[PDB]
């Protein structure tokens, strides 16, 4: 997760808050340290190799200092609801080929902005009702997008029966109409998916989409049958993978910048962020001004992560300590 | 327009060249993407229409004025263009720019002498 | 099939190791929006004025 | 696809050449057998379609991109 | 029936099983011979010219030895059932030309894989019902494929009346609607045929097919009317011709390899396989290893045929003798 820096960013993990430098025993233990006059602030953190101290912050040169709740960094998974509009026809018209399109803004493995489609075919006959249409359209979509052949779909397909109205019925490339035995299917939902993530190689990223409907002839008029409305998300993607990458990149500012390049001849860094946990972040932007003739500012920032347990307890205590030490007025989560 | 019509485009060519023409300098240029180029070709290559094709392809509207499609690539740029057309592609591709061409230029980009040297190194 | 496969060129390598190649794009990028906040930091709701 | 459509093939040409084109290097090649070549020609040589033919025959999709059928024998 | 060989194949006919070498009187009489220590096994068979002995099998070098029931080598004759689908229309639509196609995978005289068609035309009018359609389509098929002009059809055409449901009503290039007087015809069956066979020139072979239906307009929509389902076969093709060819080819490994080449100046071999009988086969794959520096294996096989009479009596006794002699554990049929 290579990022843009105001000349530097440093990350220290607040795995545990201790009162004194003597209590720093485990890796991740941290203590905010400031003098009694409150001229400078620094952090003493226990690395796997002894305690390390952060840069010293001249508390007159602090540009801003705010903390996040770990809900701001979460990515809701977008999901639409597809439905055939009662205006054109509340039920499929025989003989017409219904072709649904999923307009993706990137390819599966690339991040450049492009137009990328996936399709779903259904040909309607004299007796096919709405339920059977959604069924066959869903299976077509699955067999066409869940042709991954290595890893996982690009979007997930479900069906909702009018009886449930809330129970998403999954559909996969293996599903077949024999498995789907309901008769009150009323829509199709299409959620985004969590794509593969690698620590310092593949950044967390999503591929949005839009369900587009091609034209059918109903009364000699080419018309659009579908309704791609956006129902509210129900699933989320936390920041653990996002934060872990922040550490992976910001540990090359005080540690080894190479990371596997000369693979046999490397230095391997131990990372304390647990991808799988949810961290609430804190950040302090400051600068160094200098002496006569040296007024140019060297702006910097020190950010700190801490696991959230619902209530942002860990970070709330950490900032309470920092406000008690440096006298700042950082706000709690 | 919310729905496409070859009539509107013929009325536009009329507006541009009705009496202003000269019967020998009526070179027109329609610029659009590929989805608009579709709507154009789908309706223009019919026979009930009045257009005829002249293989570099050029068209001749029923008005008798010489036309030239120049499908530009930026009309489909998915970066600057974000809104999606219900019929596919980005809506900026469903967009025609009809310009009268002839013989001094109507459009030119202004420049100042010595603007290519404003490169400074603050090091 | 041989004609089809002669339509392509040939690269002559020295060994039988797995081969790889790099792929690059462009910086021109769209950036989605997380939210928008007003002058007092309140988040702009959908059913709100300008 | 279970049923053929010239729209899907036009959408495919769009995908391939929408902004990536250069208006002078958009040479495309569609390879298929003879039954697919049938479906193509049956629907392409119509007038309601947007394709025009350029006698070695080459086609020009309504997208303005130059096409070339190469019916291969192994299909 | 030229075959692939693991360096050799030899065939001996077990027309009769005798207990001793002295009882070998008629051609085809055979006796398995092995010593008491069971080191080697060989067969003494009466040829038209005296008793011949097979190769000697070192019973330590036997790779495999299995026998077949003569039902494995039989070829069931494939037959479909053609019918117009009630979806498009349960009865022919007037004005439309119904054209049926029979997609053969080879030509009549060649074995190379190709696409080869035969057609059947019927044009439907206001009063034509299903029965009359099947009738006229069958007669068209017969007149179009039974244009053999030398030998025999490429497939056989029959009709089934709803009353019988099991009695195939044959249709030939000579049949005419006057001969077909029923009104409850409900399908058309199309069986494969036994093509010409010559002893060592024309191998037994079949030409599969698939009934394909062209498109008709029913409601402005081009549609397929037919249902080419595969009913179970009722006729079979035994191995007599298949085995006879095996002998014809495998008798050139101990006999004369030329067979009619220098036609006046030839040697003519007497063959004991009766094409028209059904044989159950046995086979013993073995090899010869050799001495110092000569470890390369010369793998071989000796196969034996015997007429089946329902129960595989002859072969069961032959193997029982071979197990009693060589101590092997070959399984019975």
PDB file of N, CA and C in Angstrom, chain A residues 119-196:
ATOM      1  N   UNK A 119     -21.692 -11.222 -18.781  1.00  0.00           N
ATOM      2  CA  UNK A 119     -23.022 -11.297 -19.353  1.00  0.00           C
ATOM      3  C   UNK A 119     -23.800 -12.458 -18.753  1.00  0.00           C
ATOM      4  N   UNK A 120     -25.117 -12.395 -18.929  1.00  0.00           N
ATOM      5  CA  UNK A 120     -26.008 -13.453 -18.510  1.00  0.00           C
ATOM      6  C   UNK A 120     -27.173 -13.592 -19.466  1.00  0.00           C
ATOM      7  N   UNK A 121     -27.344 -14.778 -20.042  1.00  0.00           N
ATOM      8  CA  UNK A 121     -28.336 -15.013 -21.080  1.00  0.00           C
ATOM      9  C   UNK A 121     -29.522 -15.786 -20.526  1.00  0.00           C
ATOM     10  N   UNK A 122     -30.708 -15.417 -20.995  1.00  0.00           N
ATOM     11  CA  UNK A 122     -31.945 -16.138 -20.722  1.00  0.00           C
ATOM     12  C   UNK A 122     -32.886 -15.884 -21.888  1.00  0.00           C
ATOM     13  N   UNK A 123     -33.487 -16.948 -22.406  1.00  0.00           N
ATOM     14  CA  UNK A 123     -34.428 -16.862 -23.513  1.00  0.00           C
ATOM     15  C   UNK A 123     -35.782 -17.321 -22.996  1.00  0.00           C
ATOM     16  N   UNK A 124     -36.773 -16.442 -23.091  1.00  0.00           N
ATOM     17  CA  UNK A 124     -38.053 -16.654 -22.438  1.00  0.00           C
ATOM     18  C   UNK A 124     -39.022 -17.369 -23.363  1.00  0.00           C
ATOM     19  N   UNK A 125     -39.822 -18.250 -22.780  1.00  0.00           N
ATOM     20  CA  UNK A 125     -40.792 -19.064 -23.492  1.00  0.00           C
ATOM     21  C   UNK A 125     -42.188 -18.767 -22.954  1.00  0.00           C
ATOM     22  N   UNK A 126     -43.162 -19.533 -23.440  1.00  0.00           N
ATOM     23  CA  UNK A 126     -44.565 -19.187 -23.220  1.00  0.00           C
ATOM     24  C   UNK A 126     -44.960 -19.249 -21.752  1.00  0.00           C
ATOM     25  N   UNK A 127     -44.353 -20.144 -20.979  1.00  0.00           N
ATOM     26  CA  UNK A 127     -44.816 -20.390 -19.626  1.00  0.00           C
ATOM     27  C   UNK A 127     -43.910 -19.843 -18.545  1.00  0.00           C
ATOM     28  N   UNK A 128     -42.722 -19.384 -18.926  1.00  0.00           N
ATOM     29  CA  UNK A 128     -41.760 -18.916 -17.941  1.00  0.00           C
ATOM     30  C   UNK A 128     -42.306 -17.714 -17.185  1.00  0.00           C
ATOM     31  N   UNK A 129     -42.256 -17.794 -15.862  1.00  0.00           N
ATOM     32  CA  UNK A 129     -42.698 -16.725 -14.989  1.00  0.00           C
ATOM     33  C   UNK A 129     -41.483 -15.958 -14.472  1.00  0.00           C
ATOM     34  N   UNK A 130     -41.725 -15.022 -13.553  1.00  0.00           N
ATOM     35  CA  UNK A 130     -40.639 -14.202 -13.028  1.00  0.00           C
ATOM     36  C   UNK A 130     -39.632 -15.049 -12.259  1.00  0.00           C
ATOM     37  N   UNK A 131     -40.119 -15.918 -11.375  1.00  0.00           N
ATOM     38  CA  UNK A 131     -39.227 -16.745 -10.568  1.00  0.00           C
ATOM     39  C   UNK A 131     -38.264 -17.537 -11.443  1.00  0.00           C
ATOM     40  N   UNK A 132     -38.797 -18.273 -12.417  1.00  0.00           N
ATOM     41  CA  UNK A 132     -37.943 -19.074 -13.283  1.00  0.00           C
ATOM     42  C   UNK A 132     -36.940 -18.210 -14.033  1.00  0.00           C
ATOM     43  N   UNK A 133     -37.322 -16.983 -14.386  1.00  0.00           N
ATOM     44  CA  UNK A 133     -36.404 -16.103 -15.098  1.00  0.00           C
ATOM     45  C   UNK A 133     -35.229 -15.715 -14.214  1.00  0.00           C
ATOM     46  N   UNK A 134     -35.513 -15.194 -13.018  1.00  0.00           N
ATOM     47  CA  UNK A 134     -34.444 -14.857 -12.090  1.00  0.00           C
ATOM     48  C   UNK A 134     -33.546 -16.058 -11.844  1.00  0.00           C
ATOM     49  N   UNK A 135     -34.148 -17.236 -11.699  1.00  0.00           N
ATOM     50  CA  UNK A 135     -33.384 -18.456 -11.480  1.00  0.00           C
ATOM     51  C   UNK A 135     -32.398 -18.694 -12.616  1.00  0.00           C
ATOM     52  N   UNK A 136     -32.900 -18.761 -13.849  1.00  0.00           N
ATOM     53  CA  UNK A 136     -32.037 -19.074 -14.982  1.00  0.00           C
ATOM     54  C   UNK A 136     -31.054 -17.947 -15.275  1.00  0.00           C
ATOM     55  N   UNK A 137     -31.446 -16.696 -15.027  1.00  0.00           N
ATOM     56  CA  UNK A 137     -30.514 -15.589 -15.213  1.00  0.00           C
ATOM     57  C   UNK A 137     -29.397 -15.637 -14.181  1.00  0.00           C
ATOM     58  N   UNK A 138     -29.721 -16.024 -12.948  1.00  0.00           N
ATOM     59  CA  UNK A 138     -28.693 -16.124 -11.918  1.00  0.00           C
ATOM     60  C   UNK A 138     -27.695 -17.225 -12.243  1.00  0.00           C
ATOM     61  N   UNK A 139     -28.188 -18.392 -12.653  1.00  0.00           N
ATOM     62  CA  UNK A 139     -27.301 -19.506 -12.967  1.00  0.00           C
ATOM     63  C   UNK A 139     -26.411 -19.156 -14.153  1.00  0.00           C
ATOM     64  N   UNK A 140     -26.961 -18.445 -15.137  1.00  0.00           N
ATOM     65  CA  UNK A 140     -26.161 -18.015 -16.276  1.00  0.00           C
ATOM     66  C   UNK A 140     -25.065 -17.053 -15.834  1.00  0.00           C
ATOM     67  N   UNK A 141     -25.411 -16.113 -14.957  1.00  0.00           N
ATOM     68  CA  UNK A 141     -24.414 -15.183 -14.441  1.00  0.00           C
ATOM     69  C   UNK A 141     -23.303 -15.921 -13.710  1.00  0.00           C
ATOM     70  N   UNK A 142     -23.674 -16.871 -12.850  1.00  0.00           N
ATOM     71  CA  UNK A 142     -22.678 -17.607 -12.084  1.00  0.00           C
ATOM     72  C   UNK A 142     -21.731 -18.365 -13.006  1.00  0.00           C
ATOM     73  N   UNK A 143     -22.284 -19.118 -13.957  1.00  0.00           N
ATOM     74  CA  UNK A 143     -21.452 -19.884 -14.875  1.00  0.00           C
ATOM     75  C   UNK A 143     -20.593 -18.995 -15.764  1.00  0.00           C
ATOM     76  N   UNK A 144     -20.916 -17.709 -15.875  1.00  0.00           N
ATOM     77  CA  UNK A 144     -20.184 -16.806 -16.750  1.00  0.00           C
ATOM     78  C   UNK A 144     -19.163 -15.950 -16.018  1.00  0.00           C
ATOM     79  N   UNK A 145     -19.430 -15.575 -14.767  1.00  0.00           N
ATOM     80  CA  UNK A 145     -18.454 -14.863 -13.953  1.00  0.00           C
ATOM     81  C   UNK A 145     -17.702 -15.791 -13.018  1.00  0.00           C
ATOM     82  N   UNK A 146     -18.371 -16.810 -12.480  1.00  0.00           N
ATOM     83  CA  UNK A 146     -17.666 -17.828 -11.717  1.00  0.00           C
ATOM     84  C   UNK A 146     -17.105 -18.876 -12.670  1.00  0.00           C
ATOM     85  N   UNK A 147     -16.425 -18.407 -13.717  1.00  0.00           N
ATOM     86  CA  UNK A 147     -15.471 -19.197 -14.480  1.00  0.00           C
ATOM     87  C   UNK A 147     -14.046 -18.841 -14.082  1.00  0.00           C
ATOM     88  N   UNK A 148     -13.878 -18.376 -12.842  1.00  0.00           N
ATOM     89  CA  UNK A 148     -12.579 -17.989 -12.309  1.00  0.00           C
ATOM     90  C   UNK A 148     -11.476 -18.947 -12.738  1.00  0.00           C
ATOM     91  N   UNK A 149     -11.679 -20.237 -12.494  1.00  0.00           N
ATOM     92  CA  UNK A 149     -10.745 -21.291 -12.866  1.00  0.00           C
ATOM     93  C   UNK A 149      -9.485 -21.291 -12.006  1.00  0.00           C
ATOM     94  N   UNK A 150      -9.258 -20.252 -11.194  1.00  0.00           N
ATOM     95  CA  UNK A 150      -8.235 -20.328 -10.155  1.00  0.00           C
ATOM     96  C   UNK A 150      -8.761 -20.053  -8.752  1.00  0.00           C
ATOM     97  N   UNK A 151      -9.366 -18.889  -8.499  1.00  0.00           N
ATOM     98  CA  UNK A 151      -9.480 -18.395  -7.128  1.00  0.00           C
ATOM     99  C   UNK A 151     -10.915 -18.238  -6.645  1.00  0.00           C
ATOM    100  N   UNK A 152     -11.721 -17.395  -7.287  1.00  0.00           N
ATOM    101  CA  UNK A 152     -12.957 -16.955  -6.655  1.00  0.00           C
ATOM    102  C   UNK A 152     -13.757 -16.065  -7.600  1.00  0.00           C
ATOM    103  N   UNK A 153     -15.067 -15.918  -7.400  1.00  0.00           N
ATOM    104  CA  UNK A 153     -15.859 -15.080  -8.306  1.00  0.00           C
ATOM    105  C   UNK A 153     -15.440 -13.622  -8.231  1.00  0.00           C
ATOM    106  N   UNK A 154     -15.973 -12.845  -9.173  1.00  0.00           N
ATOM    107  CA  UNK A 154     -15.775 -11.404  -9.203  1.00  0.00           C
ATOM    108  C   UNK A 154     -16.919 -10.655  -8.538  1.00  0.00           C
ATOM    109  N   UNK A 155     -18.120 -11.228  -8.555  1.00  0.00           N
ATOM    110  CA  UNK A 155     -19.228 -10.792  -7.719  1.00  0.00           C
ATOM    111  C   UNK A 155     -19.963 -12.046  -7.272  1.00  0.00           C
ATOM    112  N   UNK A 156     -20.762 -11.900  -6.221  1.00  0.00           N
ATOM    113  CA  UNK A 156     -21.514 -13.009  -5.657  1.00  0.00           C
ATOM    114  C   UNK A 156     -22.987 -12.845  -5.994  1.00  0.00           C
ATOM    115  N   UNK A 157     -23.623 -13.951  -6.367  1.00  0.00           N
ATOM    116  CA  UNK A 157     -25.008 -13.961  -6.816  1.00  0.00           C
ATOM    117  C   UNK A 157     -25.857 -14.654  -5.765  1.00  0.00           C
ATOM    118  N   UNK A 158     -27.003 -14.054  -5.458  1.00  0.00           N
ATOM    119  CA  UNK A 158     -27.969 -14.644  -4.551  1.00  0.00           C
ATOM    120  C   UNK A 158     -29.368 -14.414  -5.101  1.00  0.00           C
ATOM    121  N   UNK A 159     -30.321 -15.165  -4.563  1.00  0.00           N
ATOM    122  CA  UNK A 159     -31.730 -14.981  -4.864  1.00  0.00           C
ATOM    123  C   UNK A 159     -32.495 -14.803  -3.565  1.00  0.00           C
ATOM    124  N   UNK A 160     -33.544 -13.991  -3.620  1.00  0.00           N
ATOM    125  CA  UNK A 160     -34.408 -13.733  -2.479  1.00  0.00           C
ATOM    126  C   UNK A 160     -35.811 -14.192  -2.837  1.00  0.00           C
ATOM    127  N   UNK A 161     -36.384 -15.042  -1.995  1.00  0.00           N
ATOM    128  CA  UNK A 161     -37.757 -15.479  -2.159  1.00  0.00           C
ATOM    129  C   UNK A 161     -38.690 -14.550  -1.398  1.00  0.00           C
ATOM    130  N   UNK A 162     -39.877 -14.331  -1.967  1.00  0.00           N
ATOM    131  CA  UNK A 162     -40.832 -13.415  -1.357  1.00  0.00           C
ATOM    132  C   UNK A 162     -41.181 -13.821   0.067  1.00  0.00           C
ATOM    133  N   UNK A 163     -41.060 -15.106   0.399  1.00  0.00           N
ATOM    134  CA  UNK A 163     -41.335 -15.548   1.760  1.00  0.00           C
ATOM    135  C   UNK A 163     -40.265 -15.047   2.721  1.00  0.00           C
ATOM    136  N   UNK A 164     -38.994 -15.225   2.364  1.00  0.00           N
ATOM    137  CA  UNK A 164     -37.908 -14.754   3.215  1.00  0.00           C
ATOM    138  C   UNK A 164     -37.784 -13.237   3.150  1.00  0.00           C
ATOM    139  N   UNK A 165     -37.485 -12.707   1.962  1.00  0.00           N
ATOM    140  CA  UNK A 165     -37.330 -11.273   1.739  1.00  0.00           C
ATOM    141  C   UNK A 165     -36.035 -10.749   2.352  1.00  0.00           C
ATOM    142  N   UNK A 166     -35.329 -11.598   3.101  1.00  0.00           N
ATOM    143  CA  UNK A 166     -34.077 -11.208   3.732  1.00  0.00           C
ATOM    144  C   UNK A 166     -32.989 -12.266   3.645  1.00  0.00           C
ATOM    145  N   UNK A 167     -33.311 -13.502   3.271  1.00  0.00           N
ATOM    146  CA  UNK A 167     -32.354 -14.607   3.262  1.00  0.00           C
ATOM    147  C   UNK A 167     -31.791 -14.743   1.852  1.00  0.00           C
ATOM    148  N   UNK A 168     -30.571 -14.252   1.659  1.00  0.00           N
ATOM    149  CA  UNK A 168     -29.910 -14.379   0.368  1.00  0.00           C
ATOM    150  C   UNK A 168     -29.628 -15.844   0.069  1.00  0.00           C
ATOM    151  N   UNK A 169     -30.123 -16.319  -1.071  1.00  0.00           N
ATOM    152  CA  UNK A 169     -29.967 -17.709  -1.484  1.00  0.00           C
ATOM    153  C   UNK A 169     -28.772 -17.780  -2.434  1.00  0.00           C
ATOM    154  N   UNK A 170     -27.627 -18.306  -2.007  1.00  0.00           N
ATOM    155  CA  UNK A 170     -26.438 -18.259  -2.863  1.00  0.00           C
ATOM    156  C   UNK A 170     -26.598 -19.084  -4.127  1.00  0.00           C
ATOM    157  N   UNK A 171     -25.931 -18.626  -5.183  1.00  0.00           N
ATOM    158  CA  UNK A 171     -25.890 -19.310  -6.468  1.00  0.00           C
ATOM    159  C   UNK A 171     -24.440 -19.364  -6.921  1.00  0.00           C
ATOM    160  N   UNK A 172     -23.978 -20.557  -7.291  1.00  0.00           N
ATOM    161  CA  UNK A 172     -22.598 -20.776  -7.687  1.00  0.00           C
ATOM    162  C   UNK A 172     -22.563 -21.477  -9.037  1.00  0.00           C
ATOM    163  N   UNK A 173     -21.358 -21.564  -9.602  1.00  0.00           N
ATOM    164  CA  UNK A 173     -21.173 -22.232 -10.883  1.00  0.00           C
ATOM    165  C   UNK A 173     -21.587 -23.697 -10.848  1.00  0.00           C
ATOM    166  N   UNK A 174     -21.755 -24.276  -9.659  1.00  0.00           N
ATOM    167  CA  UNK A 174     -22.192 -25.657  -9.524  1.00  0.00           C
ATOM    168  C   UNK A 174     -23.695 -25.781  -9.331  1.00  0.00           C
ATOM    169  N   UNK A 175     -24.359 -24.716  -8.898  1.00  0.00           N
ATOM    170  CA  UNK A 175     -25.787 -24.776  -8.634  1.00  0.00           C
ATOM    171  C   UNK A 175     -26.553 -25.133  -9.903  1.00  0.00           C
ATOM    172  N   UNK A 176     -27.704 -25.772  -9.714  1.00  0.00           N
ATOM    173  CA  UNK A 176     -28.573 -26.154 -10.815  1.00  0.00           C
ATOM    174  C   UNK A 176     -30.015 -26.043 -10.348  1.00  0.00           C
ATOM    175  N   UNK A 177     -30.918 -25.832 -11.309  1.00  0.00           N
ATOM    176  CA  UNK A 177     -32.308 -25.535 -10.976  1.00  0.00           C
ATOM    177  C   UNK A 177     -32.898 -26.548 -10.006  1.00  0.00           C
ATOM    178  N   UNK A 178     -32.391 -27.782 -10.010  1.00  0.00           N
ATOM    179  CA  UNK A 178     -32.884 -28.775  -9.063  1.00  0.00           C
ATOM    180  C   UNK A 178     -32.631 -28.344  -7.626  1.00  0.00           C
ATOM    181  N   UNK A 179     -31.554 -27.594  -7.391  1.00  0.00           N
ATOM    182  CA  UNK A 179     -31.263 -27.113  -6.044  1.00  0.00           C
ATOM    183  C   UNK A 179     -32.168 -25.952  -5.657  1.00  0.00           C
ATOM    184  N   UNK A 180     -32.664 -25.206  -6.639  1.00  0.00           N
ATOM    185  CA  UNK A 180     -33.510 -24.039  -6.407  1.00  0.00           C
ATOM    186  C   UNK A 180     -34.951 -24.449  -6.690  1.00  0.00           C
ATOM    187  N   UNK A 181     -35.705 -24.723  -5.626  1.00  0.00           N
ATOM    188  CA  UNK A 181     -37.036 -25.308  -5.738  1.00  0.00           C
ATOM    189  C   UNK A 181     -38.149 -24.347  -5.337  1.00  0.00           C
ATOM    190  N   UNK A 182     -37.838 -23.075  -5.113  1.00  0.00           N
ATOM    191  CA  UNK A 182     -38.866 -22.120  -4.736  1.00  0.00           C
ATOM    192  C   UNK A 182     -39.600 -21.606  -5.975  1.00  0.00           C
ATOM    193  N   UNK A 183     -40.695 -20.885  -5.731  1.00  0.00           N
ATOM    194  CA  UNK A 183     -41.518 -20.330  -6.799  1.00  0.00           C
ATOM    195  C   UNK A 183     -41.847 -18.862  -6.569  1.00  0.00           C
ATOM    196  N   UNK A 184     -41.273 -18.243  -5.541  1.00  0.00           N
ATOM    197  CA  UNK A 184     -41.554 -16.861  -5.181  1.00  0.00           C
ATOM    198  C   UNK A 184     -40.290 -16.011  -5.207  1.00  0.00           C
ATOM    199  N   UNK A 185     -39.372 -16.324  -6.115  1.00  0.00           N
ATOM    200  CA  UNK A 185     -38.189 -15.496  -6.303  1.00  0.00           C
ATOM    201  C   UNK A 185     -38.598 -14.153  -6.893  1.00  0.00           C
ATOM    202  N   UNK A 186     -38.116 -13.068  -6.284  1.00  0.00           N
ATOM    203  CA  UNK A 186     -38.563 -11.734  -6.642  1.00  0.00           C
ATOM    204  C   UNK A 186     -37.438 -10.768  -6.988  1.00  0.00           C
ATOM    205  N   UNK A 187     -36.180 -11.190  -6.925  1.00  0.00           N
ATOM    206  CA  UNK A 187     -35.075 -10.292  -7.236  1.00  0.00           C
ATOM    207  C   UNK A 187     -33.773 -11.081  -7.246  1.00  0.00           C
ATOM    208  N   UNK A 188     -32.714 -10.412  -7.690  1.00  0.00           N
ATOM    209  CA  UNK A 188     -31.358 -10.947  -7.682  1.00  0.00           C
ATOM    210  C   UNK A 188     -30.444  -9.864  -7.131  1.00  0.00           C
ATOM    211  N   UNK A 189     -29.624 -10.217  -6.147  1.00  0.00           N
ATOM    212  CA  UNK A 189     -28.675  -9.289  -5.545  1.00  0.00           C
ATOM    213  C   UNK A 189     -27.272  -9.692  -5.972  1.00  0.00           C
ATOM    214  N   UNK A 190     -26.415  -8.695  -6.175  1.00  0.00           N
ATOM    215  CA  UNK A 190     -25.071  -8.916  -6.692  1.00  0.00           C
ATOM    216  C   UNK A 190     -24.084  -8.105  -5.867  1.00  0.00           C
ATOM    217  N   UNK A 191     -23.405  -8.754  -4.927  1.00  0.00           N
ATOM    218  CA  UNK A 191     -22.509  -8.050  -4.025  1.00  0.00           C
ATOM    219  C   UNK A 191     -21.098  -7.993  -4.595  1.00  0.00           C
ATOM    220  N   UNK A 192     -20.335  -7.016  -4.114  1.00  0.00           N
ATOM    221  CA  UNK A 192     -18.910  -6.985  -4.369  1.00  0.00           C
ATOM    222  C   UNK A 192     -18.221  -8.069  -3.544  1.00  0.00           C
ATOM    223  N   UNK A 193     -16.966  -8.342  -3.885  1.00  0.00           N
ATOM    224  CA  UNK A 193     -16.209  -9.409  -3.247  1.00  0.00           C
ATOM    225  C   UNK A 193     -14.863  -8.889  -2.768  1.00  0.00           C
ATOM    226  N   UNK A 194     -14.380  -9.491  -1.686  1.00  0.00           N
ATOM    227  CA  UNK A 194     -13.044  -9.216  -1.182  1.00  0.00           C
ATOM    228  C   UNK A 194     -12.036  -9.951  -2.052  1.00  0.00           C
ATOM    229  N   UNK A 195     -11.271  -9.203  -2.837  1.00  0.00           N
ATOM    230  CA  UNK A 195     -10.310  -9.795  -3.747  1.00  0.00           C
ATOM    231  C   UNK A 195      -9.053 -10.200  -2.988  1.00  0.00           C
ATOM    232  N   UNK A 196      -8.188 -10.992  -3.621  1.00  0.00           N
ATOM    233  CA  UNK A 196      -6.956 -11.433  -2.955  1.00  0.00           C
ATOM    234  C   UNK A 196      -6.112 -10.278  -2.432  1.00  0.00           C
TER     235      UNK A 196
END
